[PDB]
């Protein structure tokens, strides 16, 4: 019912001390695995209120094959602008290798549009991945990818989706992690005439920093409300869903929580 | 704890029916995870015999970033004899992505000595990683890497790994999955003078052939006895392992089971 929230309490006990880079004193778990059923409900957090314009618009913005911050700019999200140079530029990251990773034959590879061919034409295929994880290009990049890399299963015509993410800031990360993924899950899925089946969730580095210990004591204290529930439009393909296909149905969560 | 045989009786007591690429039938699970406490031992299964010479060689073959199945056989081992080319070469696959990943610009990434260093120099460090996944090349393999890709991990001067699987050929794959990662982070933590911690295997597709069956019902009806240990020789390099550096000990496994492979 509430698996990112035992895991959350489960690194806040067990979890041991260690420092980043940079940052603050971490508790930090390795290899965690967090799993959501989502035929059972949209996994959007319902003990803090999280922020799914965000959310969306970043997926919506990896899914244009964006490098750049402006697009984001224009519907009013900044959780990039941390990291974006004077251009706004974020190099090769996420979008970029989602969209057109650079083989060595001079082509680009749209590993979406592969995934969700494999989905519609071999769907036991054990090969419907995705990976943002470039060797080549991860010291041009603000950032090396931290969702880095995720699979598609199918099961009685029902889509699962398993992501690895290296490094899992718990308390502000993870829980837009749940939500992109889950949502971008709903959309292949949609494209691909599945149902969902799975989130399953891997981590690296599981840690909660320092700050958010107190932010995070809170939030481990309020009872989990039921899950909302995920609704799209119609669209002849998945680069034409917009923010205004989506809607989130019945979410009603416990107060924000901010944190830095 | 039998992480291993606990996992093969769950995916053939509740996987799904399925069919796949090998024309074979297929009971599937997705997305499970074993781990394993390396200082209690070194996971070579006891339930059958796994032969650990070629486990070990190919991983050596690995570290060499070699590709043709000739040094394989100039140590007798033939796992990968048909899947390569007439010429013994089978694309550039799991080493040649370790050592040398060609990068736009054409130069070859060393993503193990880079590993090392980072260990060596920054065990905290989140990006310890190395991947085979190398989208620009999988055409160009002779199979797509079933082991794709795992992360190194540091805490009280205890060196984890976890690898992530896409694909797992539960009853003839893994165990030699097992050995191989658990060797390898034995020589990592070695060469950055750490102990070892946890192995962590996650799978995507974790499958038990319908030809595996019988076989596989004839190793869950034996007794699990305790793993044996492992002993590395000292070297200055990651790279300057030998099998004689790699010692077995205590290991007295129940008796091999033969079984025919999915090509
Ligand atoms: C995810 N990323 C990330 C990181 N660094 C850390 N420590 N954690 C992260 O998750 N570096 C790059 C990147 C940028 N993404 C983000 C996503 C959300 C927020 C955050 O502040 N979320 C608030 C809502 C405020 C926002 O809507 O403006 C929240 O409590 O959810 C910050 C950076
Ligand atoms: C792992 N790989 C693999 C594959 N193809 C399939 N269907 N499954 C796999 O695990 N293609 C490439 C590769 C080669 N590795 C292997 C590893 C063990 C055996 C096998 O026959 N093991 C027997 C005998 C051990 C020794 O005599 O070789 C055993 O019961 O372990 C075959 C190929
Ligand atoms: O998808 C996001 N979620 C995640 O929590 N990371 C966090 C993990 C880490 O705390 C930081 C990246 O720093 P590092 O490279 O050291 O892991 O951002 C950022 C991504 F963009
Ligand atoms: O890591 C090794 N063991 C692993 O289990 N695969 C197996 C799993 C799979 O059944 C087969 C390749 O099948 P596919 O490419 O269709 O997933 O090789 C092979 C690797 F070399």
Redesign the interface.
């Given at each position: 019912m509430t698996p990112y929230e035992d895991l959350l309490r489960f690194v806040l006990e067990t979890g041991?001390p260690?420092?980043?880079?940079t940052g603050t004193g971490t508790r930090?778990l390795?290899?965690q695995?967090m799993?959501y059923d989502l035929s059972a409900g949209f996994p959007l957090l319902t003990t803090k209120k999280v922020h799914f314009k965000s959310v969306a618009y970043e997926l919506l913005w990896f899914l244009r094959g964006d490098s750049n911050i402006g697009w984001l700019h224009e519907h009013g999200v900044t959780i990039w602008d941390e990291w974006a140079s004077d251009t706004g530029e974020l190099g090769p990251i996420y979008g970029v290798?989602w969209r057109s990773?650079?083989?060595?034959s001079g082509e680009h590879?749209d590993?979406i549009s592969a995934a969700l061919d494999l989905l519609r034409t071999d769907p036991?295929?054990?090969?419907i991945?995705v990976?943002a994880?470039?060797?080549?290009?991860?010291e041009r990049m603000a950032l090396?990818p931290c969702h880095?890399?995720f699979?598609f299963?199918v099961?009685?015509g029902r889509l699962?989706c398993?992501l690895?993410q290296?490094?899992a800031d718990l308390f502000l990360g993870v829980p837009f992690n749940i939500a992109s993924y889950a949502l971008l899950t709903h959309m292949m899925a949609a494209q691909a005439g599945l149902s969902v089946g799975?989130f399953?969730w891997?981590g690296?580095?599981c840690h909660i920093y320092d700050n958010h210990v107190e932010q995070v004591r809170l939030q481990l204290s309020r009872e989990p409300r039921p899950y909302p529930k995920l609704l799209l439009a119609d669209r002849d393909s998945i680069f034409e869903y917009t923010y205004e296909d989506i809607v989130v149905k019945n979410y009603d969560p416990h107060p924000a929580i901010k944190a830095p």
């Open positions: 041991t260690k420092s980043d880079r930090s390795f290899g695995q799993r290798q990773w650079p083989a060595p590879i590993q036991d295929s054990r090969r991945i990976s994880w470039n060797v080549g290009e991860i090396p880095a890399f699979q299963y099961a009685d699962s398993q690895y290296r490094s799975e399953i891997t690296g580095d």
